[PDB]
Paper text:
The Y234C mutation is particularly prevalent in chronic lymphocytic leukemia, where it has been associated with chlorambucil treatment. The crystal structures of the Y234C and Y236C mutants revealed that both mutations induce a substantial loss of hydrophobic interactions, resulting in the formation/expansion of internal cavities in the hydrophobic core of the DBD, without affecting its overall architecture, and, as such, these mutants represent classical ts mutants. In the Y234C mutant, the side chain of Ile232, next to Cys234, was flipped relative to its orientation in the wild type, with the CD atom extending into the void created by the large-to-small mutation. Minor shifts of 0.7–0.9 Å were also observed for the side chain of Val197 lining the pocket. The net result is a modest expansion of the internal cavity volume near the space previously occupied by the phenolic side chain of Tyr234. The Y234C mutation induces a modest expansion of small preexisting cavities, with a flip of the Ile232 side chain filling some of the void created by the loss of the aromatic side chain of Tyr234. The drastically different stability loss induced by the Y234C and Y236C mutation (ΔTm of 8 vs 17 °C) is particularly interesting, given that the two mutations affect the same region of the hydrophobic core. Here, ATO had a much more stabilizing effect on Y236C (maximal stabilization by 4.1 ± 1.0 °C) than on Y234C (maximal stabilization by 2.2 ± 0.5 °C). In those experiments, the Y234C mutant showed both conformational and functional rescue, monitored with the conformation-specific antibody PAb1620 and by reporter gene assay, respectively. Y234C and Y236C, which are destabilized via the formation of internal cavities, are classical ts mutants with the potential to be reactivated with generic stabilizers.
Author numbering: 96 to 292
């Protein structure tokens, strides 16, 4: 009833990476290593790097799913709020209820789990292109953390799983997400709060 969040590199040495975008007031997406937390604006591009030590088999896939970070909310499906699920901002593939989209990938598939009702998005794993050392996916988060009737100020985690063609686990990583108006200022504030503690 709760997806695992245990980091697992697996046989291929799978792990995520993030750009170093800084904390200027104008930044639209920024990652805090100290907090393991991504801060981003609503519906903006969030680059997430996929790193491996060796190339997994053809048919490997990459899935993203959100869960509530606090244990007392972990069994509740993370979904878009009653406003945003009705705002007709569809991209043609993502159901309007899904918080996480992978943008610019025509092979993205969106799953409503028939048993858990949880949402996820899954794309084929592509090995890095010539001259690159990693593969980058571009995620969008389609509600603010503060959206009433949705996340409702509750922190979430994104879990990224590397899966075989049957959906079996090959690797797992995760990060907290805050979707907010000013990611640069919020990252600075939370990093200062951590330093004071
Ligand atoms: Zn919303």
């Amino acid at each position: 009833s709760v997806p695992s969040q245990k980091t697992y590199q697996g046989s291929y040495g799978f792990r995520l990476g993030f750009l170093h975008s800084g904390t200027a007031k104008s930044v639209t997406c920024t990652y805090s290593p100290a907090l393991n937390k991504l801060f981003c604006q609503l519906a903006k591009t969030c680059p997430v790097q996929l790193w491996v030590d060796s190339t997994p088999p053809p048919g490997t896939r990459v899935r993203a799913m959100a869960i509530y970070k606090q244990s007392q909310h972990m069994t509740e499906v993370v979904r878009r709020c009653p406003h945003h699920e009705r705002c007709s901002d569809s991209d043609g593939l993502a159901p309007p209820q899904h918080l996480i989209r992978v943008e610019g990938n025509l092979r993205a598939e969106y799953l409503d789990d028939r048993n858990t009702f949880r949402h996820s998005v899954v794309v084929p794993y592509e090995p890095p292109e010539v001259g690159s050392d990693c593969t980058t996916i571009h995620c969008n988060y389609m509600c603010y953390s503060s959206c009433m009737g949705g996340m409702n100020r509750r922190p979430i985690l994104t879990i990224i799983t590397l899966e075989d063609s049957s959906g079996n686990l090959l690797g797992r990583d995760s990060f907290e997400v805050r979707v907010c108006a000013c990611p640069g200022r919020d990252r600075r504030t939370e990093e200062e709060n951590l330093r004071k503690k």
